[PDB]
Design a protein around this ligand. Structure first.
Ligand SMILES: *[C@@H]1O[C@H](CO)[C@@H](O)[C@H](O)[C@H]1NC(C)=O
Ligand SMILES: *[C@@H]1O[C@H](CO)[C@@H](O)[C@H](O)[C@H]1NC(C)=O
Ligand SMILES: *[C@@H]1O[C@H](CO)[C@@H](O)[C@H](O)[C@H]1NC(C)=O
Ligand SMILES: *[C@@H]1O[C@H](CO)[C@@H](O)[C@H](O)[C@H]1NC(C)=O
Ligand SMILES: *[C@@H]1O[C@H](CO)[C@@H](O)[C@H](O)[C@H]1NC(C)=O
Ligand SMILES: *[C@@H]1O[C@H](CO)[C@@H](O)[C@H](O)[C@H]1NC(C)=O
Ligand SMILES: *[C@@H]1O[C@H](CO)[C@@H](O)[C@H](O)[C@H]1NC(C)=O
Lengths: 49, 616, 340, 49
């Protein structure tokens, strides 16, 4: 399998051992936009603009 | 530039017709932009005129040379999207305010959404139209009385209405049924409690204007010395905010300690109950032997759930040098100039003042009750609401048990889900967020090559270093100005709240005011005061009926001889063919006398005539 | 020797339009070379939104407190239709009641409220209608849609005007029909007689003269109703607040046409005439000025919200002490001889 | 920048000035021209005139 690359923003999550476990692309969906705005993976309930 | 006839045909293109109704990029003889065209009929274009401008210098029209037609230029839509997301959900709901679903699905969206419908606010995506159902509280408020609710298993989101308040309904009449009205009078009652928190202070924040900017570098200090003082304006604002906080605390202490006198024979270890009412959970220590802590058990339970208190900051700052782990953010903030100072008065002194104010309304000479004993004052304040004195004199142990149960309930309610602690933790989190933002402000480039002065001083020349440090200095000074403006805006509201706090302390606790619907909710009886983190806690006792009955009452009667009688805080009932009097808050028939009836000298029109009342 | 009854009016501001501003949409409309520089001022964007959200939350809490004060301890019967019962003791209340019961619909305001709202266009419903008549037909050359195209937009409040009108109607009915939950259980004529007697008037004249009092109340209500044809003080303030809001919005919008010492106030000409190494400075020159303007605007808003909240608290106190009860505070509700 | 800071400080202080003036108006209307049935408002407990 081959896929192209580009310069884009990504969110990284490091555990207590320094291993990447989760990641989300901020330019994929609106939930990913909310996650990158809150810099987390389980944002609180609210109305995000 | 970009206007005229002399053009460069290096990048040549073919001429295209002018399209109307779509937002496209146009190159009209050098005029470049983006907008929508519209064919109109304009006759103001002369021979030497081909463009239409406004007062701001924007093209809003033109006339083509090849085809003498007129058009208007208007930009297309540009807005944002409002999304409501729950705690754990797959995808959040969408709402395009003031836009139809057709326009969204045809112009700004290219995803085939299965759920879509129009509303009063706009097109709603990923939701169900259930406006026929109403709720009392919802965390996703959209406006105009609509809010989105989440239901765990179509789509889990629902579009319902919002109605947080409603009135109580009865099955009585709204007319005069046979000359008498139909109203309900309570037959049984109890005592209920209610807590309330009012913020009276805020953490005193002090910022070192010479440490936040130019921490330890000498060239940075020499460059900052060229901007004048630029730090005295911040220091004066911080000092005046601290002075306002100190004046507020002193005024609160004076209001708590205004005109109070006790006896020199109390010990708080043997005299802690009156009329079988337990008050041990609302008293500290007053006597000879007592430790460094004088907080009541309620204050202890309140302070044990908050970490950032008057002593918490002191302990956190003590645990910065040496120790085991210095990973706390408070030490990092203190190492940059941001530090919190303790208030002028300790919490133990406020707790002692509150204990003295509470005792002043519990033992002779009853300073906080104008010289009236506690049970007598309670009976008077209950009678003032329309309750006969007989049922109060007969039911005293019941009132004591109700007070004890209310105290136990208000003490146990703070364990699982309190209400006063929410405001305290919200204030703490707001202060922490402000401090974290002010700290993270130092990690911005502000147009420079880096946000660290060490790299700039170890990589570039002194002139380049100055050029790169100037922008950082300006940005940090702007941030400090914004922060002190925010601090002023917050201290104004803190003063506004402390004013009402002092007013309620003076008019609801240490005295009984005739102001109805001010301390409680119309049936207020007694209010107490307790010490709380960054404020005070009030315990409001009220009169709460439990049972009711339907009776027929009369507004007023007229006796023989064109005389009239009018009741005060009561009504006239009829039993066994006899007119009597009853209270407005308790059903207890009693003979008609002169101490509860207003005498008149005129017979009204709609008053019931009864020449059988033998009253002088 | 002889007396009459006079009426007065007073307007107290309790809320304000909720203005939301986006840093990106205001600074860099649709340009990437501008976003690349705005990304450096990261912390300057997520502070204006936070301040505006705090202001909106404070306004919502204020509106909820006003609603709670208007709907605190109101017991009404279930046999009131608001159309069969509209007058008591020869005193009309048609111009002061809306619609209450299981027979109403969307329209629930009163004729007086309708007459007052028919002269004010820049209301929440007005903003909604304007944003609907924006782009997509009904040519949007107005300034509101132009402000909306740059990030400046006004959001509607949490509670609509219909719910507030219903709350006021319920509060008015609470002191008009039994049980009198807003008059301590005293009927309206007896309450008026007691309030007049409390000033030093004997009960004989009050008991003998009741139709005169009813006619005086009706005449006062009619004079208050047919008095908005001219320009009163209440309507003057209701227009002045929205005029000041519009002036502030236009002054904020006009800031986009300033050069701040650059070659031009438009990023298109800078990006189409100069190279990026020479255009970055020109873009930052405008970014700084626009950020300063937004900071000044949010500072002014945070300064005004305090006075707004103070006025709202004063209105809540007047509602709790002068409307739903009779407080023995002289020179507080009226000019000494206040009745109700 | 200095002028903006000064006018911001003035606009901030105006609110406290207006609050104090409103309190003064209330105290004048409820303690000088009339005897209010309130305690610990005009004076200190035993207030006469
Ligand atoms: C939106 O789409 C419709 C249909 O595709 C089209 O007729 C209309 O011109 C579009 N609007 C704009 C502003 O491009
Ligand atoms: C447009 O007007 C000019 C001025 O009279 C004229 O010379 C030209 O022929 C006109 N163009 C067309 C297409 O009629
Ligand atoms: C949503 O439901 C309400 C109540 O049934 C109805 O009046 C309204 O027309 C519905 N909306 C749409 C877009 O069908
Ligand atoms: C009134 O309520 C109390 C509380 O439960 C109860 O103990 C008492 O028996 C009741 N009295 C009557 C007459 O129902
Ligand atoms: C008076 O009240 C106290 C406190 O409730 C009680 O202990 C005492 O027994 C009462 N006196 C009499 C004679 O009942
Ligand atoms: C008081 O004035 C009214 C209005 O003119 C009049 O109807 C009434 O008779 C007057 N009362 C007396 C006692 O003159
Ligand atoms: C007295 O009753 C009549 C009907 O019999 C009614 O029209 C009038 O309004 C009533 N007046 C008062 C003061 O209740």
């Amino acid at each position: 399998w081959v896929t192209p690359l580009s310069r884009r923003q990504y969110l990284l999550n490091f555990d207590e051992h320094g291993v990447i476990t989760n990641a989300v692309d901020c330019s994929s969906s609106f939930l990913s936009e909310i996650q990158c705005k809150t810099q987390s993976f389980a944002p609180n309930t609210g109305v995000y603009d | 530039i970009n206007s005229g006839t002399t053009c460069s045909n290096d990048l040549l293109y073919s001429n295209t017709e002018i399209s109307t109704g779509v937002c496209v990029n146009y190159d009209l003889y050098g005029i470049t932009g983006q907008g929508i065209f519209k064919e109109v009929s304009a006759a103001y274009y002369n021979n030497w005129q081909n463009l239409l401008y406004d007062s701001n210098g924007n093209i809003i029209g033109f006339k083509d040379f090849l085809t003498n037609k007129t058009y208007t230029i208007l930009p297309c839509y540009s807005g944002r999207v409002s999304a409501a997301f729950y705690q754990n959900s797959s995808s959040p709901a969408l709402l395009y305010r003031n836009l139809k679903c057709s326009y969204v699905l045809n112009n700004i969206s290219f995803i085939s959404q299965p759920f879509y419908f129009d509303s009063y606010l706009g097109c709603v995506l990923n939701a169900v139209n259930l406006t026929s159902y109403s709720v009392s509280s919802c965390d996703l408020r959209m406006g105009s009385g609509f809010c989105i609710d989440y239901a765990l298993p179509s789509s889990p989101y629902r579009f319902v209405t919002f109605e947080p308040f409603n009135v109580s309904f009865v099955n009585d009449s709204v007319e005069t049924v046979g000359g008498l009205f139909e109203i309900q009078i309570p037959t049984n009652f109890t005592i209920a409690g209610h807590e309330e928190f009012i913020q009276t202070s805020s953490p005193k924040v002090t910022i070192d204007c010479s440490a936040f900017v130019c921490s330890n570098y000498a060239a940075c200090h020499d460059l900052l010395s060229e901007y004048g003082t630029f730090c005295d304006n911040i220091n004066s604002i911080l000092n005046e905010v601290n002075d306002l906080l100190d004046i507020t605390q002193l005024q609160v202490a004076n209001a708590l300690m205004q005109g109070v006198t006790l006896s020199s024979n109390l010990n708080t270890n043997l005299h802690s109950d009156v009329d079988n009412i337990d008050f041990k959970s609302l008293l500290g220590c007053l006597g000879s032997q007592c430790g460094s802590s004088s907080r009541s058990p309620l204050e202890d339970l309140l302070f044990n759930k908050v970490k950032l208190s008057d002593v918490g900051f002191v302990e956190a700052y003590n645990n910065c040098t040496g120790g085991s782990e210095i990973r706390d953010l408070l030490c990092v903030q203190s190492f940059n100039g941001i530090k919190v100072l303790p208030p002028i008065l300790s919490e133990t002194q406020i707790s002692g003042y509150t204990t003295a104010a509470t005792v002043a309304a519990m033992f002779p000479p009853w300073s906080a009750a104008a010289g009236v004993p506690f049970p007598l004052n309670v009976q008077y304040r209950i009678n003032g609401l329309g309750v006969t004195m007989d049922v109060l004199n007969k039911n005293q142990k019941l009132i004591a048990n109700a007070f004890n149960k209310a105290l136990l309930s208000i003490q146990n309610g703070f364990t699982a889900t309190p209400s006063a602690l929410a405001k305290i933790q919200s204030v703490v989190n707001a202060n922490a967020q402000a401090l974290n933002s002010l700290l993270q402000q130092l990690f911005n480039k502000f147009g420079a090559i880096s946000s660290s002065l060490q790299e700039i001083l170890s990589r570039l020349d002194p002139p380049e270093a100055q050029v790169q440090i100037d922008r950082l200095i300006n940005g940090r000074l702007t941030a400090l100005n914004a922060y002190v403006s925010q601090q002023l805006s917050d201290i104004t509201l803190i003063k506004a709240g402390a004013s009402r706090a002092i007013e309620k302390v003076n008019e609801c606790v240490k005295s009984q005011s005739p102001r109805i619907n001010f301390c409680g909710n119309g049936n207020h009886i007694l209010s107490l005061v307790q010490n709380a983190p960054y404020g005070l806690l009030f315990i409001h006792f009220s009169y709460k009926p439990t049972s009711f009955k339907t009776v027929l009452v009369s507004p007023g009667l007229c006796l023989s001889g064109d005389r009239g009688i009018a009741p005060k805080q009561g009504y006239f009932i009829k039993q066994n063919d006899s007119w009597m009097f009853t209270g407005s808050s308790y059903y207890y028939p009693e003979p008609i006398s002169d101490k509860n009836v207003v005498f008149m000298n005129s017979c009204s029109v709609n008053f019931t005539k009864a020449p059988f009342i033998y009253l002088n």
